[PDB]
Design a protein around this nucleic acid. Structure first.
Lengths: 123, 129, 166, 240, 88
RNA sequence: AGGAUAAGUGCAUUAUGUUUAUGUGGUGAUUUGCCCUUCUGUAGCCA
RNA sequence: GUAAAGCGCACGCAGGCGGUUUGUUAAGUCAGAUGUGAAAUCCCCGGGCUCAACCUGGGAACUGCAUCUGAUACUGGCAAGCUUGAGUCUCGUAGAGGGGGGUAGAAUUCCAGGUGUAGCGGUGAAAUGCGUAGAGAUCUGGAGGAAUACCGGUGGCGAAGGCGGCCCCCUGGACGAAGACUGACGCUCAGGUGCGAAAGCGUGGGGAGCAAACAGGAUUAGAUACCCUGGUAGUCCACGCCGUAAACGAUGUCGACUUGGAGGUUGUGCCCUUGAGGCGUGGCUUCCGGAGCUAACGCGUUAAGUCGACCGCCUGGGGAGUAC
């Protein structure tokens, strides 16, 4: 109620702009890919969407988005991940940087091109 | 029991106007008498008397310029247990110099304009809105 | 058929648009509803919700209702003389005194509502519901908690308001 | 002047109107319950009307286009009767909204109304189906009876005279929206707030509706002696 | 319950001996007689919790008046408190 | 003999007005969303 | 209030807080004085390098700190009041508060005898059930335990949940009124101790009816839901063990102030006591609506108004009132 309540019994404290799940207190982080899944969609859709399981270096494992026609991927290759939820998958909280580490720069994007590793304004 | 009697003083002036009364009477601190004089001179009450000692009591007559005046909104800010004191640098400007803060200094009860002009600080009692 | 208030200046702030459905009983008709704000340059309580068949007839209806049962209200200088927190129906908005050195600072349709209201330099954060239909009450409730200048000395400032009717 | 409150010591009653609790905000100016119902008396209205009878003097100084609106089961004749004068217009059938706020459309329909009225009363309204004509005539008559107030009058009235509150909500509702000052007769089931001038009283019959609003009073008759130097020189005949 | 002959005896033994029932010592000794009366009831059974609220009223108030009294004069306090017994 | 306020002829189902199986997800109506005012100003936006 | 969020409730130490006046003190308070707070990247005024970025003199936010002198408007300490807070005596009054005693009639159920014959029961309609070994019903007389209407109401009581046949004994707590007294003895409450509707549940009491389970019927894609029938622990009583919840003025505690009217029902003054009434003055308790408040319902003198002190608690949902 009064300020006296708050000196006598302190409150909780909200923050924002930090509510997308993320690891090692940093924006990008590397791990070995473990498994590739074609998996069934969330939300009413029909796209059998493509995800990877990744093994990160700090001893945890998370599931991250992949995409683009004809992109290179195998179940032993080192790739970099960046936080970013995908709202059509069974719980993808990260996406994969195609242009990073063991994988090379790919096309089949428009809407984010510094992400997923692409050159030029739309070519 | 009411622990703050100056909030209670102000809640009687506030309900006074809301029930459109011509006088409002109450129990009277030394502090109360002393506050009522600032409010009288800056014209937030019209006038008052204090009488008895075996029952000491304040009677004041209300503000009007519209029929239901800015006396419906006067609030204590430095209360029991929420004591807050301001220096000669930190004094309260209320309502772009239309409104008043009433400040009890070591040199007596006056508005913030006269406490600033003296260069005193003290306990910051109530703001108008 | 009513008296109306005017400003010598044009405001055509369309804030929202909607459609009316009964879905089986006569099925669904093409009608729209609309909300439009008519200020003055210094402010009005002018807010109008009206409805018709098409969008143009609908807005012009709503623009009419923003200037009947309403009067203009006025405030000197591009700031407000009170730090008060205006609330109207869960849409709560804030003000604190400021300079002329800042003008507007706001986005969407809100920067256009505040300019006619005279409370654009004092513009501080809004909280609660801040979707278009209720955010726009700045120039209504924020001009009913109003203070405005009329004194020559700060120590005559409460005395000068008393003698305005005594 | 005093004659208007010499008549309130003579009528003022209704012996209750509605509910055990009545309207609380009129309670000061009015008498409380007796024997398991509510009763009112003329006695509690005279201290109120010892100054407040000065407002009948302010609607008689600018008198030219007055409208008596709000009819009820026993109040209807009293709305006709206090408005019997030739500067003063009245309805006899219930009021409805838009008769002052969509006045545009109403004045277009008056202009239609007096034409089809001269036609019907001359006999010039005939059709080979008599039913379609006599049925239009019955409904034309209801328009004539409903509109007869604004019908013969030069435009929107300078005051609005509400006799009833209890069922004729609308007549007060629209007066506040056009800003036109209100001249009100309130009962013990209605508050005296939110209207500009009151007679404390009851809504029915000739007990407050023409007992101060007629030639028997002095306060509706000393306002009108102040019209005779402002817009006219002689006009006191017209009005009651 | 409390009756005239218990109340008169208390005025006779405690506070001023006439026309006073209100003072700190005698007020405490009138409360004592109702606590004793309640303990009279509590010598039939012990699931008497709806009455126990009241027992604790009469005690809590003895704590209030014993506090006031010992701040006024240590004589009335030390005499009263021993002359009205209670506890081991 | 008070089962004699006689029903206060004031009385009416008198306080749950209830129960005999179900059938996936999104979907209609517009690319100028534009036709009220001087100065203090506005809907992509202006006097 | 209902969105996440008033502690389950009373009582109250420590701590926080103190109606009103006099005396008094000066812990906090505030002013005054003096010492301190280097440097620019930041800030304010210069200056120099091809401006600038950069670096830098004077001033400064220098983010940090000191004590003396003085004041008493303010809180705190303390002594005696005051009443404007609260406490207490006798007198009166309402009620299912608590603990322990006493007592009657009648439906279901049973036995017996008398009289007497075929359906009775159940329900939406229904079948399972009961019954010719004579049921159902009825007269007479005994058996037995929960239970106690209608009065009984939106009543009233208890600390909140909680209390219900009627009565008394023991006793609490509240409601009114005059005589009389004390005279801040006050407010809140971390910790705390104390304390149960109900069932769960140990033992003792007890069992007519109803019932989870278990069976069987009816329903249907079935049928555990829906609905019934037998039928047990249970229900039903008392205390006792950790007190669960929709454990509530839904709204913490308690108090001051703010247009009323009326209902329920009650102290008491007054009435033709003229019908649960009116007026005078208090009472809890509820309808109605004004000033003011809400997102809406709704609140409105018992606030969700105006506020007071002081404590409780919340920070998207699910998963979780669980885990730990």
């Amino acid at each position: 109620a009064t300020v006296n309540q708050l000196v006598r019994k302190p409150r909780a404290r909200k923050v924002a702009k930090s509510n997308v799940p993320a690891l090692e207190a940093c924006p990008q982080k590397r791990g070995v890919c473990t498994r590739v899944y074609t998996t069934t969609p969330k939300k009413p859709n029909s796209a059998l969407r493509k995800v990877c399981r990744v093994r990160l270096t700090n001893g945890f494992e998370v599931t991250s988005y992949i995409g683009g026609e004809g992109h290179n991927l195998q179940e032993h290759s080192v790739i970099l991940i960046r936080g970013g939820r995908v709202k059509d998958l069974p719980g993808v909280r990260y996406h994969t940087v195609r242009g990073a580490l063991d994988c090379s720069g790919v096309k089949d994007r428009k809407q984010a091109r510094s992400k997923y590793g692409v050159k030029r304004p739309k070519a | 029991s009411m622990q703050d009697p100056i909030a209670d003083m102000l809640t009687r002036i506030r309900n006074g106007q809301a029930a459109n009364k011509a006088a409002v009477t109450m129990p009277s601190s030394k502090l109360k008498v002393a506050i009522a004089n600032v409010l009288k001179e800056e014209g937030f009450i019209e006038d008052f008397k204090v009488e008895g000692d075996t029952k000491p009591e304040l009677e004041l007559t209300l503000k009007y310029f519209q029929g239901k005046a800015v006396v419906e909104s006067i609030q204590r800010v430095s209360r029991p247990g929420l004591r807050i004191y301001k220096r000669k640098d930190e004094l309260p400007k209320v309502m772009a110099g239309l409104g008043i803060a009433v400040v009890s200094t070591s040199k007596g009860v006056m508005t913030d304009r006269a406490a600033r002009q003296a260069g005193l600080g003290g306990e910051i009692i109530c703001y108008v809105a | 058929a009513h008296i109306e208030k005017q400003a010598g200046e044009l405001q055509e702030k369309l804030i929202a648009v909607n459609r009316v459905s009964k879905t089986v009983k006569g099925g669904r008709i093409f009608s729209f509803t609309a909300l439009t704000v008519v200020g003055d340059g210094n402010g009005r309580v002018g807010f109008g919700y009206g409805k018709a068949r098409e969008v143009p007839a609908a807005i012009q209806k709503a623009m009419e209702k923003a200037r009947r049962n309403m009067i203009n209200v006025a405030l000197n200088n591009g700031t407000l003389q009170h730090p008060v927190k205006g609330v109207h129906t869960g849409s709560r908005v804030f003000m604190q005194p400021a300079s002329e050195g800042t003008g507007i600072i706001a986005g969407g349709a809100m920067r256009a509502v505040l300019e006619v209201a005279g409370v654009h330099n004092v513009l501080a954060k809004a909280y609660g519901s801040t979707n278009p239909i209720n955010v726009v009450r700045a120039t209504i409730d924020g001009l009913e908690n109003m203070n405005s200048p009329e004194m020559v000395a700060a120590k005559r400032g409460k005395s000068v308001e008393e003698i305005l009717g005594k | 002047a005093t004659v208007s409150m010499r008549d309130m010591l003579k009528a003022g009653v209704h012996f209750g109107h509605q509910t055990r609790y009545w309207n609380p905000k009129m309670k000061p100016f009015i008498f409380g319950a007796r024997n398991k119902v509510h009763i009112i008396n003329l006695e509690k209205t005279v201290p109120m009307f010892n100054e407040a009878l000065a407002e009948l003097n302010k609607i008689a100084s600018r008198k030219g286009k007055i409208l008596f609106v709000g009819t009820k089961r026993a109040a209807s004749e009293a709305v006709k009767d206090a408005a019997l004068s030739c500067d003063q217009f009245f309805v006899n059938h219930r009021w409805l909204g838009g008769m002052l706020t969509n006045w545009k459309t109403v004045r277009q329909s008056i202009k239609r109304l007096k034409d089809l009225e001269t036609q019907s009363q001359d006999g010039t309204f005939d059709k080979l189906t008599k039913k379609e004509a006599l049925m239009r005539t019955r409904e034309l008559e209801k328009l004539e009876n409903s509109l007869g107030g604004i019908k013969d009058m030069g435009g929107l009235p300078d005051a609005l005279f509400v006799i009833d509150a209890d069922h004729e909500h609308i007549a007060i509702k629209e007066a506040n929206n056009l800003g036109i000052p209100v001249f009100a007769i309130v009962d013990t089931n209605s508050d005296p707030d939110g209207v500009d001038f009151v007679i404390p009283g009851n809504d029915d019959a000739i007990r407050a509706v023409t007992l101060y609003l007629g030639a028997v009073a002095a306060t509706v008759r000393e306002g009108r002696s102040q019209d005779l130097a402002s817009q006219a020189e002689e006009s006191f005949v017209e009005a009651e | 319950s409390l009756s005239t002959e218990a109340t008169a005896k208390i005025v006779s033994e405690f506070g001023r001996d006439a026309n006073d029932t209100g003072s700190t010592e005698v007020q405490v000794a009138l409360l004592t007689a109702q606590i004793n009366h309640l303990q009279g009831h509590f010598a039939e059974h012990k699931k008497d919790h709806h009455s126990r609220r009241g027992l604790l009223r009469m005690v809590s108030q003895r704590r209030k008046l014993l506090d006031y009294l010992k701040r006024k004069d240590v004589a009335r306090y030390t005499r009263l408190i021993e002359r009205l017994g209670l506890r081991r």
